[PDB]
């Protein structure tokens, strides 16, 4: 949450996105060779349940930027970005997520703060994508 909004800790953010993957390599590791009612099944159960809050705000931060390459794809931020350039102003992605309905208020502030800003403000949707969804993916994959 904290280094998504600053557009200075993109490669911090990266690198600890590539050690959360790890961390959950690891741990899916661990699980190889379960069986059914397994002590280690028990204690990483266990363990999730210690860590629920921080699990949620992950699995929230995920679900958010999964559906934003939805969105992104939905023909109506088309319309709002009728050029293959990929720019587009931060009033149209604004009324983008507001008409798609599918993100909530806060949601909708989150990923504003979290837009690049612009001096035109035209952000580049393209990149947007290409630098949250992807790790949102490829991690979101292996929690579920």
Known sequence: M???QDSS???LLKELMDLQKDMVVMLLS???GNVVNGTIGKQMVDML????????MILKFFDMFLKLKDLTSSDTFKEYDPDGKGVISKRD????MESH??????ETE???SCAETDENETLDYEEFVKRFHEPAKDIG???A
Do not use: D, G
Not at 49 to 56: A, G, M, Q
Not at 93 to 96: D, E, N, T, W
Not at 101 to 106: G, I, R, V
């Open 2 to 4: 904290k280094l998504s």
């Open 9 to 11: 800790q993109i490669e």
């Open 30 to 32: 661990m699980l190889e």
């Open 49 to 56: 349940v210690e860590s629920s809050n921080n699990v949620e």
């Open 93 to 96: 992605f604004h009324k983008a």
């Open 101 to 106: 309905k599918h993100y909530t208020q806060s």
């Open 110 to 112: 989150f990923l504003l």
């Open 141 to 143: 994959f292996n929690v």
